[PDB]
Amino acid sequence: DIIIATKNGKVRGMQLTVFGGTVTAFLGIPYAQPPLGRLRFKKPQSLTKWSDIWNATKYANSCCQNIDQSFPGFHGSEMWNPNTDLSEDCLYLNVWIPAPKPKNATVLIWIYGGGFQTGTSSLHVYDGKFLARVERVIVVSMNYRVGALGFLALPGNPEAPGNMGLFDQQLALQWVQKNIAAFGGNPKSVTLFGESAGAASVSLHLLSPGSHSLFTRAILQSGSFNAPWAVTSLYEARNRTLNLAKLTGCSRENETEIIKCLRNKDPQEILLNEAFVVPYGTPLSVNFGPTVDGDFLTDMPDILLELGQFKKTQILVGVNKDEGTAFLVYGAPGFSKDNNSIITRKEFQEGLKIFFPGVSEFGKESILFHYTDWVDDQRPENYREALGDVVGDYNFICPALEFTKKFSEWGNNAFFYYFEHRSSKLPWPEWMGVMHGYEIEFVFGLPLERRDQYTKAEEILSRSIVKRWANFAKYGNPQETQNQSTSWPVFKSTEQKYLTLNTESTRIMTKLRAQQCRFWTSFFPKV
Ligand SMILES: COC[C@@H]1CCCN(CCNC(=O)c2cc3nn(CC4CCCCC4)cc3cc2Oc2ccc(F)cc2F)C1
Ligand SMILES: *[C@@H]1O[C@H](CO[C@@H]2O[C@@H](C)[C@@H](O)[C@@H](O)[C@@H]2O)[C@@H](O[C@@H]2O[C@H](CO)[C@@H](O)[C@H](O)[C@H]2NC(C)=O)[C@H](O)[C@H]1NC(C)=O
Ligand SMILES: *[C@@H]1O[C@H](CO[C@@H]2O[C@@H](C)[C@@H](O)[C@@H](O)[C@@H]2O)[C@@H](O[C@@H]2O[C@H](CO)[C@@H](O)[C@H](O)[C@H]2NC(C)=O)[C@H](O)[C@H]1NC(C)=O
Ligand SMILES: *[C@@H]1O[C@H](CO[C@@H]2O[C@@H](C)[C@@H](O)[C@@H](O)[C@@H]2O)[C@@H](O)[C@H](O)[C@H]1NC(C)=O
Ligand SMILES: *[C@@H]1O[C@H](CO)[C@@H](O)[C@H](O)[C@H]1NC(C)=O
Ligand SMILES: *[C@@H]1O[C@H](CO)[C@@H](O)[C@H](O)[C@H]1NC(C)=O
Ligand SMILES: *[C@@H]1O[C@H](CO)[C@@H](O)[C@H](O)[C@H]1NC(C)=O
Ligand SMILES: [Cl-]
Ligand SMILES: [Cl-]
Ligand SMILES: [Cl-]
């Protein structure tokens, strides 16, 4: 029987067998007053202590969210949907600790992604028990509010100030600061990592003064706040908050009375109207996301990045070979997961309108011009592969590259990876390649489970990635020192070296997507 005394009460865990050893899991520890009633849309409030023994023995509720229902019965999409009840009462976190209890273990904190509209810490690809068993780090993950319940903004107004979900994450980092030592963790050796919206979150914690003292190092997988989907303007945030109020019959004159009105609606009416607060948005539109609130975020984050106003520490940043392909079947004409999605020039051009809705005619012609000068105009998948690269380069790879370049110019060590292994178990079609999100399971060491039908080469790749990530957390340096591995060089803005992750041979390359990112980073923002 394992019971830890925390600052707010006792908590009881459970033991798990992992690889012939033991991990102690504390699932579903609350870290905040449940944000219900007059607390909906406000910053997370601190936790009133309890005297009982909280049984932290099952994952808690996931936060309210709309569910991906685009492929019913399909594991490739449904494995990302929540696996616990949805509830506004969802401010809980999980803790995996090695057994026997470590003495002063490095802590890894996971922040899931999901477009800031979905996600939950209880997905099985986020299960922290392998990392605690194999690397003897402590793994923590938390649920944070998403969608309008997490990011509805009336900037200035504390009834709905924006960024509530980011403050949920922040209050969880504070909880680790105040409690993780009781579990054998080192509060001074805390690494944040996350993917997609989670990675963009991590990068915003690097800018936020209130998080400066809450973590040591940061890892950003396929995401950074300067991606074009990661930050909402104050103009959009207001236009979207008012649109939501109109659609719910809540639009008033006194802003505080709109919030009071929105507080009496049931989550489902809020959820069902979220989709339409944007007149013309991309697929999976980030309706409600981070804003410049003057609290978590003091200025436009591009300005903070450009002028060195962020935490000085090491970062590990990376992307996947085919970031864009997964999004093409959520609205691009001519695409399907169930055929090879060979599209025409006209279909390509229609796709640009789908994924660049507000953009001028000239703007979309400039995208076409730069991605359609063919090595071979007779190849039939030309337009299918160009559209994926367009979405991937614009939304993930080039912003991540630009974030790393700008961040390292202020002197800190940065390491950049390029993940290019397609999972042998991947259920999506082969034309999607090395998909967004399908490195996570390698990071969490799922292929270390020989029962799970991964190949041997994938077990070795996962083991190497898990060592590099852990060595980055512990020591600030993502090396595998014992197995004659390729040394991972620091990323510098002059040379721009990066490391490729694959099953065969790990390589040092330079200047990923150089031609494409000069287009997206220097030209396209003008249009
Ligand atoms: C991506 O779709 C299939 C994947 C397989 C692997 C990871 N995904 C699971 C993890 N969620 C994501 O990665 C996620 C990434 C996103 N980026 N944005 C901005 C912008 C949108 C236009 C193009 C470029 C980026 C919006 C996103 C929504 C996402 O979450 C989903 C939410 C509701 C849903 F109905 C389906 C979702 F995905 C499921
Ligand atoms: C700010 O929002 C208005 C509100 O229009 C919304 O449109 C519906 C789809 C739904 O979300 C409702 O709650 C809102 O009324 C936008 O006005 C629309 O603009 C488009 C083109 O920009 C036009 O075709 C529509 O006819 C407009 N609809 C109405 C009802 O006025 C407005 O454009 C938004 N502002 C910006 C800069 O995008
Ligand atoms: C690939 O499939 C898309 C999607 O079509 C659906 O999925 C298929 C697997 C099959 O079950 C179809 O009957 C379904 O309609 C095809 O695109 C559609 O093409 C039709 C007719 O040509 C057109 O009217 C629709 O609007 C298209 N739908 C979309 C979403 O684009 C596509 O043609 C198929 N391509 C190849 C090369 O096989
Ligand atoms: C635990 O260790 C502390 C120092 O941790 C180390 O220094 C920090 C700044 C990080 O770089 C981190 O990665 C290092 O591991 C001690 O100050 C502390 O007292 C120790 N506590 C114990 C052993 O109970
Ligand atoms: C926690 O679990 C133990 C049994 O393992 C039980 O005695 C106790 O009542 C539980 N606490 C609850 C249900 O709150
Ligand atoms: C709006 O209503 C709130 C809540 O009663 C009140 O405190 C505030 O002063 C009002 N402001 C205006 C401008 O009507
Ligand atoms: C190093 O190599 C051995 C086999 O030589 C392998 O079993 C082990 O897991 C490897 N370790 C890492 C950290 O990659
Ligand atoms: Cl609900
Ligand atoms: Cl052509
Ligand atoms: Cl260059």
PDB file of N, CA and C in Angstrom, residues 158-193:
ATOM      1  N   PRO A 158     -12.071  39.928 -16.251  1.00  0.00           N
ATOM      2  CA  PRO A 158     -11.676  38.715 -15.514  1.00  0.00           C
ATOM      3  C   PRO A 158     -12.735  37.628 -15.484  1.00  0.00           C
ATOM      4  N   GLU A 159     -13.974  37.919 -15.879  1.00  0.00           N
ATOM      5  CA  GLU A 159     -14.982  36.869 -15.923  1.00  0.00           C
ATOM      6  C   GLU A 159     -14.694  35.872 -17.031  1.00  0.00           C
ATOM      7  N   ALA A 160     -13.945  36.293 -18.029  1.00  0.00           N
ATOM      8  CA  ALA A 160     -13.606  35.533 -19.214  1.00  0.00           C
ATOM      9  C   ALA A 160     -12.387  36.185 -19.847  1.00  0.00           C
ATOM     10  N   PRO A 161     -11.217  36.104 -19.205  1.00  0.00           N
ATOM     11  CA  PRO A 161     -10.059  36.874 -19.670  1.00  0.00           C
ATOM     12  C   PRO A 161      -9.248  36.198 -20.762  1.00  0.00           C
ATOM     13  N   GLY A 162      -9.545  34.947 -21.105  1.00  0.00           N
ATOM     14  CA  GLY A 162      -8.755  34.199 -22.059  1.00  0.00           C
ATOM     15  C   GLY A 162      -7.664  33.397 -21.372  1.00  0.00           C
ATOM     16  N   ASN A 163      -7.130  32.414 -22.105  1.00  0.00           N
ATOM     17  CA  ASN A 163      -5.955  31.643 -21.696  1.00  0.00           C
ATOM     18  C   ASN A 163      -6.167  30.805 -20.435  1.00  0.00           C
ATOM     19  N   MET A 164      -7.418  30.600 -20.011  1.00  0.00           N
ATOM     20  CA  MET A 164      -7.700  29.762 -18.844  1.00  0.00           C
ATOM     21  C   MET A 164      -7.017  28.393 -18.924  1.00  0.00           C
ATOM     22  N   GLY A 165      -7.006  27.773 -20.106  1.00  0.00           N
ATOM     23  CA  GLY A 165      -6.351  26.481 -20.244  1.00  0.00           C
ATOM     24  C   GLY A 165      -4.850  26.563 -20.027  1.00  0.00           C
ATOM     25  N   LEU A 166      -4.222  27.645 -20.500  1.00  0.00           N
ATOM     26  CA  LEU A 166      -2.803  27.826 -20.219  1.00  0.00           C
ATOM     27  C   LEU A 166      -2.567  27.984 -18.722  1.00  0.00           C
ATOM     28  N   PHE A 167      -3.489  28.661 -18.022  1.00  0.00           N
ATOM     29  CA  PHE A 167      -3.342  28.808 -16.577  1.00  0.00           C
ATOM     30  C   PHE A 167      -3.623  27.491 -15.853  1.00  0.00           C
ATOM     31  N   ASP A 168      -4.531  26.656 -16.387  1.00  0.00           N
ATOM     32  CA  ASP A 168      -4.669  25.286 -15.886  1.00  0.00           C
ATOM     33  C   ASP A 168      -3.318  24.574 -15.917  1.00  0.00           C
ATOM     34  N   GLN A 169      -2.657  24.584 -17.084  1.00  0.00           N
ATOM     35  CA  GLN A 169      -1.324  24.002 -17.174  1.00  0.00           C
ATOM     36  C   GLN A 169      -0.390  24.633 -16.148  1.00  0.00           C
ATOM     37  N   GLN A 170      -0.442  25.959 -16.015  1.00  0.00           N
ATOM     38  CA  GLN A 170       0.477  26.633 -15.109  1.00  0.00           C
ATOM     39  C   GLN A 170       0.232  26.214 -13.672  1.00  0.00           C
ATOM     40  N   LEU A 171      -1.032  26.171 -13.256  1.00  0.00           N
ATOM     41  CA  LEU A 171      -1.335  25.738 -11.898  1.00  0.00           C
ATOM     42  C   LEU A 171      -0.872  24.305 -11.652  1.00  0.00           C
ATOM     43  N   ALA A 172      -0.837  23.473 -12.695  1.00  0.00           N
ATOM     44  CA  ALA A 172      -0.321  22.120 -12.524  1.00  0.00           C
ATOM     45  C   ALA A 172       1.195  22.124 -12.346  1.00  0.00           C
ATOM     46  N   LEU A 173       1.912  22.970 -13.099  1.00  0.00           N
ATOM     47  CA  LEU A 173       3.359  23.063 -12.899  1.00  0.00           C
ATOM     48  C   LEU A 173       3.684  23.535 -11.484  1.00  0.00           C
ATOM     49  N   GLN A 174       2.911  24.495 -10.975  1.00  0.00           N
ATOM     50  CA  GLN A 174       3.064  24.939  -9.596  1.00  0.00           C
ATOM     51  C   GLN A 174       2.839  23.801  -8.604  1.00  0.00           C
ATOM     52  N   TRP A 175       1.838  22.944  -8.868  1.00  0.00           N
ATOM     53  CA  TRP A 175       1.578  21.790  -8.013  1.00  0.00           C
ATOM     54  C   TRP A 175       2.788  20.867  -7.960  1.00  0.00           C
ATOM     55  N   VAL A 176       3.446  20.656  -9.103  1.00  0.00           N
ATOM     56  CA  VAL A 176       4.661  19.847  -9.107  1.00  0.00           C
ATOM     57  C   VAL A 176       5.742  20.527  -8.276  1.00  0.00           C
ATOM     58  N   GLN A 177       5.885  21.848  -8.422  1.00  0.00           N
ATOM     59  CA  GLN A 177       6.853  22.591  -7.617  1.00  0.00           C
ATOM     60  C   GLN A 177       6.625  22.382  -6.120  1.00  0.00           C
ATOM     61  N   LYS A 178       5.368  22.367  -5.680  1.00  0.00           N
ATOM     62  CA  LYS A 178       5.082  22.276  -4.254  1.00  0.00           C
ATOM     63  C   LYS A 178       4.971  20.843  -3.734  1.00  0.00           C
ATOM     64  N   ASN A 179       4.813  19.842  -4.599  1.00  0.00           N
ATOM     65  CA  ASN A 179       4.500  18.496  -4.123  1.00  0.00           C
ATOM     66  C   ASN A 179       5.400  17.387  -4.646  1.00  0.00           C
ATOM     67  N   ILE A 180       6.141  17.593  -5.737  1.00  0.00           N
ATOM     68  CA  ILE A 180       6.772  16.448  -6.381  1.00  0.00           C
ATOM     69  C   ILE A 180       7.899  15.871  -5.531  1.00  0.00           C
ATOM     70  N   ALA A 181       8.486  16.666  -4.636  1.00  0.00           N
ATOM     71  CA  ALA A 181       9.521  16.130  -3.763  1.00  0.00           C
ATOM     72  C   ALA A 181       8.981  15.014  -2.878  1.00  0.00           C
ATOM     73  N   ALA A 182       7.714  15.100  -2.464  1.00  0.00           N
ATOM     74  CA  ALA A 182       7.139  14.048  -1.628  1.00  0.00           C
ATOM     75  C   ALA A 182       7.077  12.707  -2.361  1.00  0.00           C
ATOM     76  N   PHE A 183       7.023  12.728  -3.695  1.00  0.00           N
ATOM     77  CA  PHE A 183       7.041  11.532  -4.531  1.00  0.00           C
ATOM     78  C   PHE A 183       8.456  11.126  -4.947  1.00  0.00           C
ATOM     79  N   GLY A 184       9.478  11.798  -4.430  1.00  0.00           N
ATOM     80  CA  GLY A 184      10.845  11.508  -4.813  1.00  0.00           C
ATOM     81  C   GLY A 184      11.362  12.285  -6.004  1.00  0.00           C
ATOM     82  N   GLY A 185      10.650  13.343  -6.440  1.00  0.00           N
ATOM     83  CA  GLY A 185      11.048  14.123  -7.589  1.00  0.00           C
ATOM     84  C   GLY A 185      11.860  15.346  -7.203  1.00  0.00           C
ATOM     85  N   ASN A 186      12.664  15.819  -8.154  1.00  0.00           N
ATOM     86  CA  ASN A 186      13.468  17.024  -8.019  1.00  0.00           C
ATOM     87  C   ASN A 186      12.731  18.224  -8.630  1.00  0.00           C
ATOM     88  N   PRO A 187      12.144  19.123  -7.828  1.00  0.00           N
ATOM     89  CA  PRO A 187      11.517  20.324  -8.412  1.00  0.00           C
ATOM     90  C   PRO A 187      12.463  21.169  -9.246  1.00  0.00           C
ATOM     91  N   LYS A 188      13.774  21.032  -9.074  1.00  0.00           N
ATOM     92  CA  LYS A 188      14.736  21.839  -9.818  1.00  0.00           C
ATOM     93  C   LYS A 188      15.120  21.233 -11.156  1.00  0.00           C
ATOM     94  N   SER A 189      14.584  20.071 -11.504  1.00  0.00           N
ATOM     95  CA  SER A 189      14.943  19.382 -12.730  1.00  0.00           C
ATOM     96  C   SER A 189      13.642  18.937 -13.385  1.00  0.00           C
ATOM     97  N   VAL A 190      12.914  19.907 -13.942  1.00  0.00           N
ATOM     98  CA  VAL A 190      11.589  19.694 -14.528  1.00  0.00           C
ATOM     99  C   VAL A 190      11.645  20.073 -16.002  1.00  0.00           C
ATOM    100  N   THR A 191      11.337  19.122 -16.873  1.00  0.00           N
ATOM    101  CA  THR A 191      11.320  19.367 -18.310  1.00  0.00           C
ATOM    102  C   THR A 191       9.883  19.280 -18.799  1.00  0.00           C
ATOM    103  N   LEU A 192       9.416  20.322 -19.478  1.00  0.00           N
ATOM    104  CA  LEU A 192       8.129  20.260 -20.157  1.00  0.00           C
ATOM    105  C   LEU A 192       8.323  19.634 -21.527  1.00  0.00           C
ATOM    106  N   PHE A 193       7.396  18.750 -21.916  1.00  0.00           N
ATOM    107  CA  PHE A 193       7.316  18.354 -23.317  1.00  0.00           C
ATOM    108  C   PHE A 193       5.864  18.205 -23.726  1.00  0.00           C
TER     109      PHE A 193
END
